[PDB]
From a paper:
Neurotransmitter:sodium symporters (NSS) constitute a large family of Na+-coupled, secondary active transmembrane transporters conserved across all kingdoms of life that includes carriers for a broad variety of solutes, including amino acids and neurotransmitters. NSS proteins transport solutes by an alternating access mechanism, based on transitions between outward- and inward-facing conformations that leave bound substrates accessible to the extracellular or intracellular environment, respectively. The transition from outward- to inward-facing conformations associated with solute transport is driven by the transmembrane Na+-gradient. In addition, it revealed a structural fold with the first ten TMs arranged in a pseudosymmetric inverted-repeat pattern with a central primary substrate binding site and two sodium binding sites (named Na1 and Na2) in close proximity.
Here we present the X-ray structure of [name] in a Na+/substrate-bound, inward-facing occluded conformation at 2.6 Å resolution. The W8A mutation combined with l-Phe binding enabled crystallization and structure determination of a state differing from previously determined conformations. Clear electron densities were observed for residues 13–511 in the chain A and residues 13–507 in the B chain of the [name] dimer, but no visible electron density was found for the first 12 N-terminal residues, suggesting that the N-terminus is disordered in the crystals. Overlaying the l-Phe substrate with l-Leu in the outward-facing occluded structure shows that they superimpose almost seamlessly in the binding pocket. In the binding pocket, F259 forms a π-π stacking with the aromatic ring of the bound l-Phe substrate and F253 in TM6. In Na2, the coordination of the bound Na+ ion remains trigonal bi-pyramidal, also as seen in the outward-occluded state, but the coordination is distorted by shifts of TM1 (located between Na1 and Na2) and TM8. Consistent with this notion, Y268, which forms a cation-π interaction with R5 in the outward-facing occluded state, has moved into hydrogen bonding distance of D369. Furthermore, the critical salt bridge between R5 and D369 is broken. Relative to the outward-facing occluded state, the putative release of the N-terminal tail and disruption of the R5-D369 interaction are accompanied by a conformational rearrangement of TM5, which corresponds with that observed for the apo inward-facing open structure.
Numbering used by the authors:
A (entry chain A): 13 to 510
B (entry chain B): 13 to 507
Write the structure that this text describes.
Amino acid sequence: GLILAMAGNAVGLGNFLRFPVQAAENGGGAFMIPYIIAFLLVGIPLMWIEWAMGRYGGAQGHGTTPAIFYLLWRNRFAKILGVFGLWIPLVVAIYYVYIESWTLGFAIKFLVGLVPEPPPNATDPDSILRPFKEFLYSYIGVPKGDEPILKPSLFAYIVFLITMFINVSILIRGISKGIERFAKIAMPTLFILAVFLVIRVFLLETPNGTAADGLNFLWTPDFEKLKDPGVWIAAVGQIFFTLSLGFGAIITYASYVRKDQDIVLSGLTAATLNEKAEVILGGSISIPAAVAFFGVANAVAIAKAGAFNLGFITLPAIFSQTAGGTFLGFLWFFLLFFAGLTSSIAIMQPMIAFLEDELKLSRKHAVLWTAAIVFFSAHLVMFLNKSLDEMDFWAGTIGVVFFGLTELIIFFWIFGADKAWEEINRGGIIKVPRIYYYVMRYITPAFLAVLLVVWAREYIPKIMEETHWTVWITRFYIIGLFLFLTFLVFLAERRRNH
Amino acid sequence: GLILAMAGNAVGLGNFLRFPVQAAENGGGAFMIPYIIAFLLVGIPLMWIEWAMGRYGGAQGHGTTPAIFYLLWRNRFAKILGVFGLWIPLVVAIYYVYIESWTLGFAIKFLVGLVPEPPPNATDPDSILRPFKEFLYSYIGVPKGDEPILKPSLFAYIVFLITMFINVSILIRGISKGIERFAKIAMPTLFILAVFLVIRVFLLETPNGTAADGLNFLWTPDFEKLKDPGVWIAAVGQIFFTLSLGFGAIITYASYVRKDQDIVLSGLTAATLNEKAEVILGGSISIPAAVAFFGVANAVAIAKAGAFNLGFITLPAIFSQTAGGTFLGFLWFFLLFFAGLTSSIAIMQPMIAFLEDELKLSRKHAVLWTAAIVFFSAHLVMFLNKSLDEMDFWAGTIGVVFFGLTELIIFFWIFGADKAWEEINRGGIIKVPRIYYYVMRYITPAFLAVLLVVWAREYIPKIMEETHWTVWITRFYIIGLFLFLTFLVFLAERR
Ligand SMILES: N[C@@H](Cc1ccccc1)C(=O)O
Ligand SMILES: N[C@@H](Cc1ccccc1)C(=O)O
Ligand code: NA
Ligand code: NA
Ligand code: NA
Ligand code: NA
């Protein structure tokens, strides 16, 4: 199935770790209403856009974003906007591989038996949260008092090295046959273990809450929080993150596929299985269990205190109250690691492809230098408090929605609305309904543009008053990354005409 | 002929700002004894070596250290060590241009009469230091109490922009005939002004000290601190800095010289001319006056609190007591600005020369991108406390004594001492005395290698115990710059 490779990179850490965080910190229910609208009016059509843009420029030997933007709009300002097609995946990879290494480190701990346990006599939210919170915080090195320096354990650093070595050895060697035999075993195993864990979580009855309260917290909307654009832009950004949109990823992969081929039905199918994997499996396992085990206030606080910490704290609590949970926990975090592994090798693909097709580097050299830029930068994420969340906000939330609007104007307003409508439907098994045409030309592009404006007039004053230097150094570091990548595209521009 | 071009290279901010700080920071006399030894055993021989390597490499179209090292020694490790010939000039330029902008800002202050004045009815050495300390600290934004974030004035930021604009213009359009007409008037005027100031300083007496006490501070040796390797490595590092050695700068300028011109006489004349402007002019004005005005305790404390601050505090105190001092303060800081301008366009030369010969960028593009890296990186030294001092130590002190040793190993142990001796003395008006053949081949490398080791086993443990996050981020940043420049050299080969 060709829809499984389109969802093998879509289903990853965003489904089981980022979604519970994004939903619980933004309210739940108040977050789900725009999250559904973003999937219909924004997420689905942009999937059709990036596959159409990619195979269009890919038919002329262009797999990189600046080369395709300039092919769709001949202007040096288009190649500058194409740098986000390299900057966003690079910044996300700086922490994504690190979060991926957390799942491998937890899998090794569960296999060997090092698991967190609830206290003997607690039966109150903060006391039973402490063993599971300290299990994660002492691994990633969270101190007390909001001190800016993290002290991760030596085991966590070594597991990060091993995770980098696994990503590099696959990007160089390629997809192996044993990996293909392991992938066809992990896809049912993940979507069978997920079935049991939805049943297990549903009958959770604790003195601190019920799973029914977690589903009540997640599916009852608060309409006064719909006036908050930070809730809206967190929802439209999570849609882009989970669908692998707003990066430079999908446009690079359609460059390697063929024209006169279906990008409509298969593009709609992988976008649905992915939402089935995180709304049902990623959303009704982690969130209701956190509300049942720790209550609402503590579940929201854990979600606000990190970008991926909720699932790492909630799932071991489930497995501590389940017969054989230590074994199932090994399966959970090892399969979650494989989900992140197939995504991280995909996130780092546009950067490696740029060093190949534009700077004429070999596979071995393009991979190893890309890994050097990720490993070196990851030390900010590993050792600076809130540095990981900052990269996740500007690349994984704000960056994807700005770069998603940019794609929707270059391809649908400058390249031609009717001209782009033909590129989407070519070879389609089914046809895109006519109502999406007016949505892609007048509704969605004139909605993301308004959201970023109504958001920036309210939160940018709060952002520029940031007091933590660990945050400003991260903002300074990622600006240097965008300038560094702009310099690389310049070296490619003075090489094509040289 | 070309001696004045080497003197516009050498004579700069290291002569009048850094040398007073480096000497007063380690004591003086205890600093000058290894300083004179470093000029004879290290500075002079490595001046001839960099000029000889540049010619031999420039004759084949190479002007940067990664390509010239690989030409003399065909190894992967040669191009990696050649990155320092790009990294040290880049790191130094990150803060050198900013220090250059200070002299321009003070020149504008003194032109319009915004001068610091000592308080009346007070001879307290802390009360008279206070307004001169505040004049600099309010400009560069030093807070009270070791806070990590600097807050320099808006005027200091705008003047930095203009200093960047002046460097970019001259680097693109070249040295105009109007400013070449200016250099022949400015550098003589600076020498005449400095000879006047040392006469003025020598006639200083205060209720807190005299200038004769200052000369006793700088020239009376202390033999207990002669066993401190940090003092030895600061004197050797200063010799490299003031003579423009230990960079890839002299090698790039030598890459345009014919292989049959004179190196020995012209290089020895420029080095000695530079030292006269440093110990006789720069060192004899700032330090004796700081001791006379503020005392020895404060002169050492100011030298340790910053990397270039002492000259900016001491000199306006001199001008506050001299008739016509505000006008003389204008000419001093303006000719000090021009002395830094001709030096900073030479510092950014290896980076520009690497973006053209390799990577095949135009002159307009190589200057603007080099100016972008420097301008971006300068915000660390502008806003993070002790970041400027950290870059100045690892590049301007430790890096130069390491890269100078590296140039010496590859040219006299790998390329061949008999071939290098033939290449230095080729076309020379006079010949190098035979005693330097054994200094270059045996004495100098055995001296620099030992000095680096004994320094590293007495100070690396204290370096790893840093308590300021602002210095670890600077160390993290400059490691990133070296990896970045190693990536560009890699892109040069596979082009
Ligand atoms: N969509 C993936 C992340 C990803 C983005 C871009 C390319 C590949 C993967 C996730 O939710 O985990
Ligand atoms: N030697 C100069 C600095 C410099 C170094 C290298 C090249 C050019 C200038 C000084 O003392 O100020
Ligand atoms: Na995946
Ligand atoms: Na996903
Ligand atoms: Na000098
Ligand atoms: Na100069």
